[model samples]
Target: STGSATTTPIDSLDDAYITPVQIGTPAQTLNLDFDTGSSDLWVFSSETTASEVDGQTIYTPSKSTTAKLLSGATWSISYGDGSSSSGDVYTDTVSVGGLTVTGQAVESAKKVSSSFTEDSTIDGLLGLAFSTLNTVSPTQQKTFFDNAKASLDSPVFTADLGYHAPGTYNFGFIDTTAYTGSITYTAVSTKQGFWEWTSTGYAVGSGTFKSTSIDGIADTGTTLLYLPATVVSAYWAQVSGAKSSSSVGGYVFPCSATLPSFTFGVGSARIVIPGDYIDFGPISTGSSSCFGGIQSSAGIGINIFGDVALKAAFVVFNGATTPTLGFASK
Candidate 1:
């Protein structure tokens, strides 16, 4: 059996899906950010300081008989964006779709950065990355997918992300109707604790594709697609009014600029991102400026194919043996 869910966008900057996850018994529901970029399933909880909670919803373990504190166990996670969260551990019954796992480790936050504390929409994060990257102390934790894998008919999950609207995430089975044509499968190099791979190269609108070898990760939590500095510069150069601003932290161009499409190699198939999608809306409300969704990932070492890039196509995370990423047009 496969479990399915519908996800909606938080914001263009957030570029994420609100994934519903049932945690604890007597089963409380929370709208979580299903992040494939990190491996700890953390929540804003009763343990979170009242001052830091804001308007966020949280899970109260005392209300559930199945909840138990893993004595002395704790976990903390920091993201590439410098955002972070740290918390204590609890074992509880967690269920997503038809897949349920008892004694699944759920990290309840005691402290959170402004990035999390300020955004009240996300109750927590459900990690879908490899289990080895789990941050729990004493003993590392297992992600919801990891715990449910053994019982699944096929250890796979497909991310059908949509723009400004709702989409679905299907686990344990693939809904062939969700995509078009065929999925172009690519080998994933997983030692980096991520779904890392090398792209065959990329190009600007109507430009010839170059065979530049770019190593990057498919990150769902990140809002924008980050590429090499040279790639980012080349694309922005075509946006007549574009300017790289340290004040903006990225490239910004006139809101009226007619942006060009960008394409990245997917083996022999190319996944193209439309000009408007890369515009990323406006810099701020009532402003005549827009931020670029494609930025430089220089300092971060590995580039990121974040939500902005993934939503352009149907993505399949086949976890059967050596994990692979399959892409097909929506």
Candidate 2:
């Protein structure tokens, strides 16, 4: 059997791609954000304190006939997007569409930060990152895909994240009709539990491409494109009044400023980010200052090709033995 999930865009493509996943025997369906940045399929559950549960749907493991506790197991996570959740482990049957994984590690949260509790619309995170990144202690856990891939027709998944629109996640097979142009493949280095690759070079708008190697991860959980401060400075130089502001939490520019289209080389193909997609939004709604979609990675060791860039292209998270990533124009 295969699986598919319809993605719901929140605010914009930079916000998140939420999909539905069914857990337990009687099946408590939850709207989940599919994250490629971390592992651990955690849910707002019965274990969560009443105050911490908020308006989200709660998964009651005790009510699921298939739920089994993984004693001594625990998990904790603090995401780059400033969200946090901690929980214990439960093994159960989790499925999406026609895909199902029995005995999948389902983390039942005991605590959640405001970002999650207030995100009442989303019930949990279905981590698509490598199982090796699972935060469960004492015993590491496998992701839904990892647990069921071998039985699948193909070990692959496609992320067709469209801007401010519903998209689809395909599993086991590539739907040729979903993407346009040829898929440009690149070697993925997963040493850090990320779908990472190095860009051959990049260019600012119509300017000549610069031959600078940039190693970064393709993170769906993050909102902005993050690179080195030096690199981000060069890109912002083209925008009028673009400056780093501690108050704004990133580089901000005039709301009317025209952003240049950004392009980068992956393998032998070059992908472009339209200028319009570069302006995330006004710093604060109608504020004249606008936050840039591109920011400095600063403390983070590696750059991140977040939703801002990913939405500009169709991506394939090739789950091959050595793992490969394919990019194509939307």
Candidate 3:
């Protein structure tokens, strides 16, 4: 079986992407962030704190005939941004696109951080990371993908993110028409339960390519691309007015300053990010200084290839015998 879903950017800068998902036998549709960086199919529901619920659509487990409480089970997860959520667990019928998984772990949020409450667009998160990353207590539950893999035509899914537009997430098969050129495959290291891989090298605009091993994870949930300080510095150096600002945080440049494109290697493939994407909008509303989409990963402790990079190419998450990641230009 195969499943196909449409994902849309939540903001002008494409800070996050959300897809519609159905939970329970009666089917309650909610817009969720399909995060590949974390594992835990959690949602804003009747259990969430009243004050935490903004304009988000919440799931009511009582309304679903297929909902069954997973007694004594609870889950909690914290993100790098310091946002977090936790709650009781329930097993319910969950569906994405046309693919359905029976008895899927559906965590009902009892509490959510202010960041979640402020962004009313995303109702919950659908984790696509390995099952090992699940935070459910007493029992670690498999992700929706893991449970549906056996029923899929192929144990794989693809992420095609668009810039300021709608994109797609395909399960069980790759959409050949969605990309161009032959895909470059790289072995994935799921040791940390992330889609981690080593990037061969990088180039700044029309400058020379620097050969270096950059180990990072593809995190769709994250908003920016984070690389080593050296690489990030070199890229910013090319922009005349760009500087690492302590007050403003990270690298920022004049809104009118010309920016260069960024290119990263995936084995023998080179995916280039347009200059426009590097300009991550203004630091604040109508601010003249804009934040660079690429920043140093030093403080984060891990490099991240986020939406800034992912939107430049088509990504394949192969979950077969040996996990692999495929990159192709679209």
Candidate 4:
């Protein structure tokens, strides 16, 4: 079953600081967000004006002995969450987890928020999701895959462990041994710049609520699983002591026991979600419970299964073959 696959957090590096991978001799240290929702590699730079680049971490090439600037091209990225950043573009040696890639496009945000600047644990995000939503351009964009794809021993994929507690976010290649079944692949849709997909339906526990009847998109950039209100309510109804609690501005349940197992039908394939995901943290109000999945931007015509959903399954985004996505066990 898709839900049977287990996920573990990517172990933090001992230094826990940025590792410089020189691209083309003169190295540059580019910060990245390994996001799946979009496929662009960008960083914050020093040249950006404070007004244009606020609340973002700006990479200082001067600080790194191996950093190199990429002429004078300007780069900017905007996220769906209304967060935006701008910076100068540069070419640098980029390295993560002891893996090094050359000539990787890096962005230096002039303005950075406290969340990015203050946090010493993560320097930047290395988006390993897909290329459809990449911020890099032909002339100036560079992705980790673009530089290292040829050298990779095997196809690279990510296992998002959305265990929000303390140690959840894990990034790296897929481990096939974790799963016991065969893997399934689905062709990617190019309509939108997202890793868009369709699922037959979503089920909770043993009862399959709806048939294979909804379009699903997997986005690592999004923090929550945005589901339709009706669908969310339908699934919650199955919980033994389910009740709508208002916290974090969403519906939550208070069932202590293991809720029904939730699953989604993807084409001929089915992916199951574990029960621990169902018992999310409480809303600050304390009146309602908060599940990992929540109701978001309804009537928007599309539903996004964010990291909360993707972490439960082994996901593959294949841009080389046909534009398609695959799911299996690690």
Candidate 5:
């Protein structure tokens, strides 16, 4: 069995990819972000307090005949960025694109942090990372991808993120036409519960490639690209008015500054992100300062190859017992 689904960017900034998910017997549809950094299929729902929810849709388990509460089960996820959500667990029929999974764990949010409430478009998050990272306790549950992998034509899923456009997430098979050039396969380390891999090196714009093995995670849930401070400084130095500012909370530059493209290696293959993609967005509306899409990952503990980098190429997440990642130019 195979499935495919459209993932639309939340906004022009490509903050997150919102994909439609059908859950329960009556089919409660909610637009959720497919995040590869975490593992827990959580959503805003009837269980969530009214004050914690603003304009998001709610998934009511009571309305679905197939829904069954996971006895004594609860889950919570806290992000280092000061945003979090906790919920009770339920198992129900969940479908994405045409793939169906019976008894898929559906975590219904009982409480949400301010940041999630402020972002009205995202109804919830669907974690695509390995199941080991699942937040459920006492009895952990499998990710949707994990439970469905056995039924998939191939034990793999692909993420085709876009820049200010709609892309897709395909399960079971790789769409040959979605990408250009041959895919470069790399070994993945699931020890950290992330789709972690090491890049051979990186180059700023047209500069010479600096061969360095940079370890990072391919996180679709993240919005920006984060690397070592040395690499970030090098990239920002190429821009005329760029600076790492504490006041602005990251590397910011004049809105008119000419940014350089960033290229990272995957084995012998190289993926280049366009200069425009690096100019994240203005720091403030009608302001001269602009935040960079690429920043230092020093505080993050590990580098993150987020949407800013993933959107520049096609990414394949292999769900085999021995997993691997495939990257291709598109």
Candidate 6:
């Protein structure tokens, strides 16, 4: 899912960092977060007069001569962060990279909360995940993908997240050259709009883990990797010179250390989570050590394999091709 807008103690209003995207004929630059959890393309507009919005990016329809507002339609959205926005609907030509799609749905939020308005970096959200959790009722409104499907040259799309390094998230095309092994295909279940899988096993260095035999789902909406306590503890135990910390409620290790790589077996394919992502985030106060990516979620029913793990491989959500997930590089 696109990152949620939220309120925090430090910055009352904060928007998650959204990727910069170019839309319209002359290419109107818009900063948007590509979210898979929800299916809606929303933006703040110049008409918004809410005091809560101070530093947020407001897309002024007047700024773009090509923008057209949808008459008599109203829209509003609230996120997991206690942030929300509301306004009228508009249609415009939207583009990302070299791909241009017209008749795109855009939200003109007139009222926005402080959590969304205070953040200067975030502009809007690009929901590309699925249609099941869409803010717009599927019976009444179609998502951007649902409308743009006919215009795309290929039915497939791939997101190539960088390997500990920054990388451009591509759309509309599938680049298969990035993968070393053949693409592993998994059937998508229609019941919950989630990509489910049963992990075969997990290994760090030469040691194999036991609790890896649990069912898991790849969810972009989730921020961190949530695993069973047995799995998280076992994986941390294999880390060299690793220690526990109470601040983040996870294990912390030296960032410079030669951390062993982990490979999670999923049926025939094995997905790997790089060590850098494992040690990329902040350190806990008690241990004063960097924490690995693995977090303990003993009872969380939705054990999620979030962006942290998806970035390691090319992820393709194939709704157009027989309810399946196609993994390859772009």
Q: How do all the candidates rank in terms of lDDT, highest first?
A: 3, 5, 1, 2, 6, 4
Name model 1 segments beyond 4 Å from true: 12-14
TM-score of each: 0.97, 0.96, 0.99, 0.74, 0.99, 0.78
In model 1, residue pairs whose N, Cα or C atoms come closer than 3 Å (at least 3 residues apart or on different chains), thus clashing, are none
Pairs with steric clashes in candidate 5:
none
36-153: candidate 1 lDDT, tens digit per residue: 8889999999989888898888999999899999999999999888989998999999888757889999999999999788888899899888888999998998988888888877
Superior candidate under TM-score, 1 versus 5: 5
Residue 136 CA displacement from its true place in model 4, Å: 5.4
Tens-place lDDT digits, model 5, residues 130-204: 999999988989999999999999999999998889999999999999999999999999999999999999999
* lDDT accuracy of residue 73 in candidate 2: 97
Q: What is the lDDT of residue 309 in candidate 6?
A: 68
Worst 10 residues of 5 by lDDT: 78-87
Worst 10 residues of 1 by lDDT: 7-16
Clashing residue pairs in candidate 6 (N, C-alpha, C atoms within 3 angstroms): 1-35, 1-36, 1-37, 1-220, 1-221, 2-35, 13-115, 36-129, 175-329, 175-330
Among these predicted structures, which one has the highest lDDT? Answer: 3
> Worst ten-residue run, lDDT, model 6?
6-15
**What is the total number of backbone clashes in candidate 1?**
0
Residue runs of model 2 more than 4 Å from their true location after superposition:
none
Preferred candidate (TM-score higher): 3 or 6: 3
Per-residue lDDT for 122-238 in model 3, tens only?
999999999999999999999999999999999999999998899999999999999999889998999999999999999999998888999999989998999999999999999
The better candidate by lDDT, 2 or 5, is 5
lDDT of 6 by residue, 1-330 (tens): 111121111121111225666555456676776666556677766787857556666677776767776667676677544677777777777766656667777777777778667666567777765566555432334566666666666555555555434445545555556566777777666465556655667776566544446666766544456777777777777776777667556667776575666667655677777665566444634444666777766646656676666666777766575656755422
Measured on C-alpha atoms, candidate 6 has an lDDT of 0.61
Which lDDT tens digits does candidate 4 get at residues 5-120?
Answer: 22222222111112222333343434334566665555545664545544444566776655677776666566665556555666667655455666676666565454455443
What is the clash count for each candidate, in the order shown?
Answer: 0, 0, 0, 47, 0, 10
